[PDB]
Amino acid sequence: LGPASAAEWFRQRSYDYGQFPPEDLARRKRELGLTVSAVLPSRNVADTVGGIIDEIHALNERAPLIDQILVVDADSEDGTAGVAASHGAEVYSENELMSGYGDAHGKGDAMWRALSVTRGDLVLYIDADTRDFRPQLAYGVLGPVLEVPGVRFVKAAYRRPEDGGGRVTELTAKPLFNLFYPELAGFVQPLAGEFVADRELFCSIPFLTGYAVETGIMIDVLKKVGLGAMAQVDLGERQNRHLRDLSRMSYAVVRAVARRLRQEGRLQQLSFFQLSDYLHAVATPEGLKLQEYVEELVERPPINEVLR
Amino acid sequence: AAEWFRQRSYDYGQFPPEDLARRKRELGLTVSAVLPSRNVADTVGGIIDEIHALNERAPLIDQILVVDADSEDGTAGVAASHGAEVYSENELMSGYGDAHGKGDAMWRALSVTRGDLVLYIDADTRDFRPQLAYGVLGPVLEVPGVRFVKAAYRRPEEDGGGRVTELTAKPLFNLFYPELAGFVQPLAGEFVADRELFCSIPFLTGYAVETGIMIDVLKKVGLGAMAQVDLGERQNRHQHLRDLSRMSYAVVRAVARRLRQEGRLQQLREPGLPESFFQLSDYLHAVATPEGLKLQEYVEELVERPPINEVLR
Ligand SMILES: Nc1nc2c(ncn2[C@@H]2O[C@H](COP(=O)(O)O)[C@@H](O)[C@H]2O)c(=O)[nH]1
Ligand SMILES: Nc1nc2c(ncn2[C@@H]2O[C@H](COP(=O)(O)O)[C@@H](O)[C@H]2O)c(=O)[nH]1
Ligand SMILES: [Cl-]
Ligand SMILES: [Cl-]
Ligand SMILES: [Cl-]
Ligand SMILES: [Mg+2]
Ligand SMILES: [Mg+2]
Numbered sequence: 249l250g251p252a253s254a255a256e257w258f259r260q261r262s263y264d265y266g267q268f269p270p271e272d273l274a275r276r277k278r279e280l281g282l283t284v285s286a287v288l289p290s291r292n293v294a295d296t297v298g299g300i301i302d303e304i305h306a307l308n309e310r311a312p313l314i315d316q317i318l319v320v321d322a323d324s325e326d327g328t329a330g331v332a333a334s335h336g337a338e339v340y341s342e343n344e345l346m347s348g349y350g351d352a353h354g355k356g357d358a359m360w361r362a363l364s365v366t367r368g369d370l371v372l373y374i375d376a377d378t379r380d381f382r383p384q385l386a387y388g389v390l391g392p393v394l395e396v397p398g399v400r401f402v403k404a405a406y407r408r409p410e411d412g413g414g415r416v417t418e419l420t421a422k423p424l425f426n427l428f429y430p431e432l433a434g435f436v437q438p439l440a441g442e443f444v445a446d447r448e449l450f451c452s453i454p455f456l457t458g459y460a461v462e463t464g465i466m467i468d469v470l471k472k473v474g475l476g477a478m479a480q481v482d483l484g485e486r487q488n489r490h491l492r493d494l495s496r497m498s499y500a501v502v503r504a505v506a507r508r509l510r511q512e513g514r515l516q517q518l519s520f521f522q523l524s525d526y527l528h529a530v531a532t533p534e535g536l537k538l539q540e541y542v543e544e545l546v547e548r549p550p551i552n553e554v555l556r
Numbered sequence: 557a558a559e560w561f562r563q564r565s566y567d568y569g570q571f572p573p574e575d576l577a578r579r580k581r582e583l584g585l586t587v588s589a590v591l592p593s594r595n596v597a598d599t600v601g602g603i604i605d606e607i608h609a610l611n612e613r614a615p616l617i618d619q620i621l622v623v624d625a626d627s628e629d630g631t632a633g634v635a636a637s638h639g640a641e642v643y644s645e646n647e648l649m650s651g652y653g654d655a656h657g658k659g660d661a662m663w664r665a666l667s668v669t670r671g672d673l674v675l676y677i678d679a680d681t682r683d684f685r686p687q688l689a690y691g692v693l694g695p696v697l698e699v700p701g702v703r704f705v706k707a708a709y710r711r712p713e714e715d716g717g718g719r720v721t722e723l724t725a726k727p728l729f730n731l732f733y734p735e736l737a738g739f740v741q742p743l744a745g746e747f748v749a750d751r752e753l754f755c756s757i758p759f760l761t762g763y764a765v766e767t768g769i770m771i772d773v774l775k776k777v778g779l780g781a782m783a784q785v786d787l788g789e790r791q792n793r794h795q796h797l798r799d800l801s802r803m804s805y806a807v808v809r810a811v812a813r814r815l816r817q818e819g820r821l822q823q824l825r826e827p828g829l830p831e832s833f834f835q836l837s838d839y840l841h842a843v844a845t846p847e848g849l850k851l852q853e854y855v856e857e858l859v860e861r862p863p864i865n866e867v868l869r
């Protein structure tokens with residue numbers, strides 16, 4: 249059971265999207281009767297969503313792969329909802345889904361809530377701010393779930409135009425994974441927005457809200473199904489894109505690990521103390537300034553325990 | 557945290573060099589500047605010159621100490637030719653073998669620093685101004701109880717430090733060491749404390765050193781005895797995000813190590829985890845390249861040095 253090392257896993261569970269031609273995936277998907285829901289957490293992305301939806305439609309014409317497109321909007325003031333709707337996608341407000349829990353706590357919350365309107369056997373999350381969307385950003389990661397029995401969770405891998413990820417990935421995720429979760433060290437883009445798993449899986453794990461979500465899922469999936477059931481697919485080049493705001497992103501990652509460490513018993517007994525209170529000291533032309541942020545880390549339970 | 561920030565942050569304008577010099581003579585204290593050097597042939601010269609220039613205006617630094625990493629670029633010769641005392645990191649405490657990175661050089665520097673105060677200064681600084689030397693001296697000389705002063709600065713707009721400071725150090729500190737969240741440049745190379753303080757704490761070697769020092773000094777003298785000085789502008793050397801990854805790991809390992817000593821970290825290895833997955837010195841850096849995916853693998857033992865007092869003659 250399981251690979252013997254991060255090295256063995258890396259050889260056995262890393263793929264190239266060229267291995268999964270779309271029309272071949274479409275056939276297997278059909279033979280298995282599986283359906284796929286693509287979820288696009290959207291927040292002020294009116295200029296890029298249309299194109300992405302369009303590309304998914306064109307792909308489907310060549311190879312029927314995506315059955316449902318969900319734009320879970322953050323009630324964007326730039327008319328995202330409209331653009332998405334007119335381009336043929338289903339559109340939901342992150343605030344109206346599971347509205348008993350109140351307004352949405354950031355990206356993680358919106359992604360968890362999406363599970364209540366996802367109908368597909370498989371659930372594929374996809375960033376919606378992507379400037380130049382290429383077909384394999386949608387189908388690449390489907391490859392191993394459809395083609396390799398045993399694989400339940402697939403993460404995208406990619407490079408900017410030798411790439412080990414963006415700053416938060418390089419400087420927060422991987423160092424923390426290498427130390428506390430060695431099994432995840434082989435992932436090239438552990439925090440990638442594009443990934444897929446069966447809906448059952450997503451419904452059986454908790455979801456951290458805000459920017460903790462990606463880290464949380466990585467840990468929780470690992471615990472749930474085993475490293476052997478996770479994989480990654482090189483998707484070629486993709487163009488990605490303020491060090492200040494990243495600071496809070498990195499904090500969310502640290503909080504996620506910390507929280508999981510608390511629960512495992514690895515982290516015991518963790519005034520000037522308040523976890524959601526992040527002191528960010530900075531140097532400005534007008535002297536030193538100590539700015540202060542507050543973001544609530546909320547864990548939503550497996551949607552399993554709420555629905556059905 | 558906040559009460560500290562108000563009461564312990566200073567501007568270098570508050571400490572004119574001539575006042576400090578006068579205060580230093582009054583107090584009878586000597587200062588040793590230590591410059592860990594690794595392939596900085598193009599910059600040490602200027603720094604050593606500036607410090608000599610400063611001394612002429614205001615006698616502040618008594619010993620200029622370049623501790624070289626046997627730099628292939630001839631750094632040691634440059635430093636010598638400019639008037640500095642040069643030592644090889646490998647000849648200091650040579651009973652410990654060759655030096656394991658920057659932390660080791662800094663620890664080893666203590667064995668030959670002669671001053672009551674020890675001012676660490678970075679040697680890669682492409683444009684060096686006088687206050688990068690005297691700024692941090694302000695509080696240790698003029699504010700009672702202050703034993704340790706760290707530099708603060710901005711890049712030529714709310715600079716919260718380099719990539720490692722913003723995305724590794726500060727997030728970790730905010731969670732595990734709230735008291736240090738006030739520091740703008742926690743991992744700054746410019747800082748100063750009395751020689752007896754440095755000689756009485758462990759030093760993590762390599763790139764874990766700045767973090768180790770901040771945690772250890774905190775524990776030892778208390779937040780109240782630490783301060784920071786805004787030194788204005790300082791160009792930072794740009795490095796590859798690949799190499800910074802290794803550095804962030806050093807930071808994480810320092811914090812993890814200390815959490816373990818505090819008992820706040822019970823198990824490091826998660827129960828269930830096969831042994832083959834457990835190797836802290838082994839850092840896996842998964843990357844995408846033009847010719848496919850690859851699993852780069854760096855090995856670097858986290859070597860720690862005992863307080864030099866217990867080992868130095
Ligand atoms: N529904 C929703 N989407 C978000 C939120 N924050 C970011 N997103 C979206 O999720 C994707 C990736 O988010 P990122 O981490 O790059 O900001 C983008 O499509 C983006 O607009 C949010 O708070 N709510
Ligand atoms: N003696 C010595 N100095 C080093 C070493 N690594 C870095 N340094 C120096 O320490 C200072 C900090 O540079 P950095 O930490 O940004 O690489 C620079 O002056 C630099 O050249 C080392 O391994 N040995
Ligand atoms: Cl909280
Ligand atoms: Cl350790
Ligand atoms: Cl080690
Ligand atoms: Mg993004
Ligand atoms: Mg540097």
Ligand SMILES: [Mg+2]
Nearest residue numbers: 835836838839
């Ligand atoms: Mg390892």
